[PDB]
Design a protein around this ligand. Sequence first.
Ligand SMILES: *[C@@H]1O[C@H](CO)[C@@H](O[C@@H]2O[C@H](CO)[C@@H](O)[C@H](O)[C@H]2NC(C)=O)[C@H](O)[C@H]1NC(C)=O
Ligand SMILES: *[C@@H]1O[C@H](CO)[C@@H](O[C@@H]2O[C@H](CO)[C@@H](O)[C@H](O)[C@H]2NC(C)=O)[C@H](O)[C@H]1NC(C)=O
Lengths: 270, 270
Amino acid sequence: ICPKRCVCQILSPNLATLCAKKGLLFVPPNIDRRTVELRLADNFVTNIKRKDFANMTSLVDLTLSRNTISFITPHAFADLRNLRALHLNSNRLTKITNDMFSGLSNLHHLILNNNQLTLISSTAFDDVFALEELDLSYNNLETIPWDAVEKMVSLHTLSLDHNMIDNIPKGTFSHLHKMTRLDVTSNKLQKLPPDPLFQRAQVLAIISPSTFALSFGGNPLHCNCELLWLRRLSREDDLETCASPPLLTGRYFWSIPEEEFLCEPPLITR
Amino acid sequence: ICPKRCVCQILSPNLATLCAKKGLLFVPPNIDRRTVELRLADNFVTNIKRKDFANMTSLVDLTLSRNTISFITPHAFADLRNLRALHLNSNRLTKITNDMFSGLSNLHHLILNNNQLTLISSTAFDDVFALEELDLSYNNLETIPWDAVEKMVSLHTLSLDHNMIDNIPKGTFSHLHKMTRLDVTSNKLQKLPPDPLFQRAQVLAIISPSTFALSFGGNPLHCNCELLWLRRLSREDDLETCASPPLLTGRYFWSIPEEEFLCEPPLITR
Ligand SMILES: *[C@@H]1O[C@H](CO)[C@@H](O[C@@H]2O[C@H](CO)[C@@H](O)[C@H](O)[C@H]2NC(C)=O)[C@H](O)[C@H]1NC(C)=O
Ligand SMILES: *[C@@H]1O[C@H](CO)[C@@H](O[C@@H]2O[C@H](CO)[C@@H](O)[C@H](O)[C@H]2NC(C)=O)[C@H](O)[C@H]1NC(C)=O
């Protein structure tokens, strides 16, 4: 049942298959299909085939953390109907196809951090709409399918720090009431959309603790009146820095008074 | 002299310019050119220009660790004649041009780990021939200019783990007598060249400690008689794993007896 290297243990009624730190180069063939937890972390798997995780209906937690995974066969996660958590962090993934995460309705946690992700095809998140956590940190992403993200009502954590994200839609986080943490540090963002969740990121006074936590440091901010709503907020200085206008270039976001966040009236050239 | 954010300190006769964790987006303009140590680590610099480190002749240690650096202007390190240590780890670098590291004769330590390096043009290491440490770990490299490496006699540390290196020349490490550590873990190596330095990686008996330390785990080894020289060595099991022949696929490198490492005689087809 349990592969030679793996230490599969049994606790009624669940079956766990522990194959972490075993120097594996590929996913072991004879893993019991009625396994519930499967740890394949800290190995050297380079690619996944359909035959690996096929037929595993009872699987609820899969861990492929810290591998050399660069490609996974389309429809290899298709039969994981009861999977709730997937760890694909610290690999060599490049793209996110639609066939990759298909049928993962019960998926609540999806982790893709420390990968070299460049593109995420739309509708790739059209089956994981009911997740609660999404970690896409430390990637080469500049855009994500926000439309599929807007359909994630039960989402409470969105990790996006250390990417190259250009901008972010204004209509997002509208019905995402359960959101409690958003990290967009070290991205190439020019501005930020206003939202009541961000109003909930203050420390105010009785005294009150911040119930929402956002991070927007390390961004080429365009310090105009379109960010004035965020400057009016009362938050701790997180070393944020303006990049433009040239007069505000270099000075801290919180070191600049509200009367210096200005915009420019429209005029007609021809 | 010292930039607004930076904390430049003076100890006779050296001048250090400390600008770490200041939320910088670019290298500050007015850094004193007669600085000796310059810490720009933990910021958000995206690209380097010639005007940044130009004219800094007295600089002996430059630290650009953990930035968003993706491109550096050719001949931007040209005038760093007295530079001995360079830290470019944890960035977004892709390529290593010849103009990049030109004239760095006195460079003894070069660190490029945790970058997305794909290619290293030859002759890029034709000026750093007198270095002592080279960290190219955690990159997408498959080949490096070995010819330029062979001219590094005073080299004692070569970090190459977690890449995609295909193979490695047999004539290397010939005159590199000062070599004391080589890490080639998590690479796509099929085999390994024999070397007296590897004979110095044993624990033998009086009792003796290993004076050389090499690591070759996480590699698709081709367990034939061409690796039999390494199997005959007496070393600690580092979870190494064979990938071929198919009969030896999956079994540990050290769990296989020496009599099973076989090769195949030549025959003529036509
Ligand atoms: C997935 O499950 C099926 C059974 O549910 C496995 O067994 C058979 O697969 C062969 C294919 O060569 C079919 O001809 C049989 O009809 C299947 N059996 C039954 C009872 O339907 C199949 O091998 C499993 N596949 C993998 C990749 O594990
Ligand atoms: C590098 O050093 C030179 C001086 O060694 C700096 O000063 C002058 O640069 C201008 C260029 O517009 C020349 O016309 C002058 O002849 C230079 N002065 C001398 C005394 O030669 C130069 O600005 C420095 N460059 C940078 C980028 O810092």
